[PDB]
Amino acid sequence: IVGGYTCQENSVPYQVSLNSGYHFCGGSLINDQWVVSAAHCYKSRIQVRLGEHNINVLEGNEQFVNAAKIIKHPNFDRKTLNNDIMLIKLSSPVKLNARVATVALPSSCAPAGTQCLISGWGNTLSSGVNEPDLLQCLDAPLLPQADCEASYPGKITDNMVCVGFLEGGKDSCQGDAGGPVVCNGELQGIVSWGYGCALPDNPGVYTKVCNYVDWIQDTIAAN
Amino acid sequence: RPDFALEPPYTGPCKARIIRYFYNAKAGLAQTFVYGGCRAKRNNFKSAEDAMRTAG
Ligand SMILES: [Ca+2]
Secondary structure, three states: OEOOEEOOOOOOOOEEEEEOOOEEEEEEEEEOOEEEEOHHHOOOOOEEEEOOOEOOOOOOOOEEEEEEEEEEOOOOOOOOOOOOOEEEEEOOOOOOOOOOOOOEOOOOOOOOOOEEEEEEOOOOOOOOOOOOOEOEEEEEEEOOHHHHHHHOOOOOOOOEEEEOOOOOOOEOOOOOOOOEEEEOOEEEEEEEEOOOOOOOOOOEEEEEHHHOHHHHHHHHHHO | OOHHHHOOOOOOOEOOOEEEEEEOOOOOOEEEEEEOOOOOOOOOEOOHHHHHHHOO
């Protein structure tokens, strides 16, 4: 997260870290056994780290659980990034407390202008690399679909939404993928892609979760 | 050596943090970079020895 601020300790209890030796992607806890992330964050073996704040120091509030089943959206496209969503079933149910909690799936698609919270342990610089120990937060609005299409000509599908600022300076970056975009207590987006980080006329592009509520519920009930 | 070996490391549009190997034409050695997760160019390898075989 570029241009953000350090989140208050455990103020984003649904945020998880995907680890395969090191932190590589984020994710969101939707129920005691399932995590939602981006499909491009696929790895054959993933350990999910919950209740985290400082990713490099053992604080004592963390729960380390391995991935049992990793299910990507059947229509995921590796080139266009359409349907960039993935479900992860945990090996054992997690203990829900004040540090570890679930985020609600969307009731409907939030309109343009809705203020949201983006979070992650990704790069904090637009030019250069600086990986934070502590979870970073960013308050940003859902942008009009016309402005998203103007920023990325012919690259935006109906399953994508732009969140951020057209002036740049504030955006999600490398290491934030799979992470949450929560608006009014509901998961409206998943960190996906963008051209660079925090660059003018190039806001981040996110997977529009409201188009996948039925797919998520049907997959959880069948597995 | 081929053209891709002299090309700068490509992070790509995706936002994952995946450590991959590339060949530096300036230093003449195999170094690491942050790959985003999608649309990789040819100067992107999973291991150090796979980079030394193809590019070295
Ligand atoms: Ca920790």
